[PDB]
Amino acid sequence: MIKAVVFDAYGTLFDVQSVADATERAYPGRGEYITQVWRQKQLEYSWLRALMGRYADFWSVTREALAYTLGTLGLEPDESFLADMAQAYNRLTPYPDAAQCLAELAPLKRAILSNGAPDMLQALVANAGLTDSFDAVISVDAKRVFKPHPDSYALVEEVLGVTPAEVLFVSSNGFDVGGAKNFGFSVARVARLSQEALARELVSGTIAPLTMFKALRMREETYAEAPDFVVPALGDLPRLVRGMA
Amino acid sequence: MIKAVVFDAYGTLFDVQSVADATERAYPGRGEYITQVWRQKQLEYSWLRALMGRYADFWSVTREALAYTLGTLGLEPDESFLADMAQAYNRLTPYPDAAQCLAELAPLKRAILSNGAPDMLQALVANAGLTDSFDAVISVDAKRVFKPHPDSYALVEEVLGVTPAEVLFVSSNGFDVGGAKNFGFSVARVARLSQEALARELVSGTIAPLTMFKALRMREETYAEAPDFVVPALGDLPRLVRGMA
Ligand SMILES: [Cl-]
Numbered sequence: 001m002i003k004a005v006v007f008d009a010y011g012t013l014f015d016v017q018s019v020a021d022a023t024e025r026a027y028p029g030r031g032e033y034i035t036q037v038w039r040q041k042q043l044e045y046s047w048l049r050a051l052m053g054r055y056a057d058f059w060s061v062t063r064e065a066l067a068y069t070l071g072t073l074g075l076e077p078d079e080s081f082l083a084d085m086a087q088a089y090n091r092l093t094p095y096p097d098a099a100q101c102l103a104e105l106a107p108l109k110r111a112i113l114s115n116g117a118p119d120m121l122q123a124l125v126a127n128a129g130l131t132d133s134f135d136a137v138i139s140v141d142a143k144r145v146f147k148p149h150p151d152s153y154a155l156v157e158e159v160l161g162v163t164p165a166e167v168l169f170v171s172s173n174g175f176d177v178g179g180a181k182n183f184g185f186s187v188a189r190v191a192r193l194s195q196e197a198l199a200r201e202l203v204s205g206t207i208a209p210l211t212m213f214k215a216l217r218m219r220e221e222t223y224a225e226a227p228d229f230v231v232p233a234l235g236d237l238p239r240l241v242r243g244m245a
Numbered sequence: 246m247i248k249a250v251v252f253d254a255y256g257t258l259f260d261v262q263s264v265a266d267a268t269e270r271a272y273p274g275r276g277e278y279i280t281q282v283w284r285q286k287q288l289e290y291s292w293l294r295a296l297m298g299r300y301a302d303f304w305s306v307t308r309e310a311l312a313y314t315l316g317t318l319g320l321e322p323d324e325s326f327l328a329d330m331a332q333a334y335n336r337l338t339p340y341p342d343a344a345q346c347l348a349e350l351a352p353l354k355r356a357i358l359s360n361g362a363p364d365m366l367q368a369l370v371a372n373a374g375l376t377d378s379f380d381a382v383i384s385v386d387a388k389r390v391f392k393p394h395p396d397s398y399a400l401v402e403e404v405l406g407v408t409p410a411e412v413l414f415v416s417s418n419g420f421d422v423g424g425a426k427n428f429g430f431s432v433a434r435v436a437r438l439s440q441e442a443l444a445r446e447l448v449s450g451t452i453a454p455l456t457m458f459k460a461l462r463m464r465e466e467t468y469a470e471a472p473d474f475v476v477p478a479l480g481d482l483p484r485l486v487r488g489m490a
């Protein structure tokens with residue numbers, strides 16, 4: 001039986017597009033571009049540092065990815081500027097139905113498992129006023145790996161004392177859905193982009209940037225095990241757990 | 246002293262864009278798009294499978310990435326179709342000056358180290374007419390990991406008998422430059438896209454999807470150690486090695 005619902009953070013509970021106005025200031029006219037490449041490179045760097053055996057926490061990864069992104073535009077921001085702007089990732093707006101979802105999921109154990117560094121996750125959760133909606137906010141930092149490395153998911157039992165079989169893992173990120181399934185969790189994927197809409201979008205003449213991010217990041221990955229469940233939004237999870245049991 | 250020049254394959258010796266006519270002919274109007282996403286997801290899947298501890302060789306990775314790419318367009322081709330089309334990756338055109346470069350390096354040991362599966366690399370090199378240009382063509386497959394995992398680079402000494410100190414590693418891929426440097430090789434990066442040109446392209450108005458790939462894939466990665474040398478072309482390598490040590 002499901003005893004805990006563990007949430008991915010970035011892209012699942014929190015909207016990574018919401019750094020929009022901060023990036024638009026870093027380079028007027030190019031906010032959309034920066035938003036997308038920043039997120040993409042942030043993910044790539046977490047995978048590559050881990051795979052290379054050169055871990056650095058998500059705060060370093062986030063700043064390195066921002067530096068790369070602004071670099072493509074010909075900028076050369078200093079550490080002070082980078083540390084300042086990267087704070088936008090600790091202010092991400094929660095999806096509008098997150099709070100209600102989490103409230104209805106009580107008394108089940110509720111937690112976050114995220115690539116985010118400890119201080120990042122605490123600030124992000126605090127800013128969103130969701131601190132008391134979680135029994136635990138788990139960072140991969142203790143294991144010095146990033147998802148989808150199995151050690152990241154091993155943390156859930158260590159912290160919550162529930163077995164993988166008793167966990168419903170929730171994520172909008174295909175690679176995270178894959179890593180959680182690989183580890184042994186039941187998984188509910190949050191799919192906000194209908195496949196059919198993307199397909200037609202990619203056929204409608206010139207292809208835009210956000211569309212590029214969407215094509216690369218909003219689908220199930222072909223190498224991964226399929227999620228047990230797919231829902232359109234977080235608010236659907238309470239109903240899923242009920243009609244599930 | 247440098248005793249061996251070890252080459253990355255995909256993107257360095259061989260042009261991954263040369264699958265264009267095949268992807269386009271296969272699906273009119275969608276070639277450029279497919280070419281970019283195919284390569285991007287091929288890389289992502291090599292990293293994510295390795296990081297999950299769920300290795301499959303590059304041939305499986307190449308076909309999974311193609312299936313994903315065609316899937317974004319709403320296509321669902323069978324395995325037979327995927328295997329046939331994926332053969333395009335075993336026929337990539339070598340860069341025009343690869344043959345001459347390798348020839349002028351004949352005194353030194355010449356090798357390839359690649360994510361490519363054994364049979365993929367043999368065909369790729371043979372079809373390019375470069376089989377007699379290498380003392381060894383090394384696949385990561387034996388280690389059952391993908392770059393930039395250190396075990397990939399460990400293969401060089403195992404096969405050639407030279408220490409990391411005696412190796413000049415050549416690559417156009419930032420993540421691979423980073424992996425080679427972390428492992429201890431001297432590295433010559435091949436940078437075919439000038440930073441200043443990319444910057445201006447990214448602001449030349451509406452950003453094209455092709456520029457998206459360039460922005461994600463053709464620069465040094467900020468988390469990675471800098472390469473020892475950067476040349477604009479393979480043909481500049483012999484001259485670089487002459488006045489090196
Ligand atoms: Cl993340």
Ligand SMILES: [Cl-]
Pocket residue numbers: 255360361
């Ligand atoms: Cl590769």
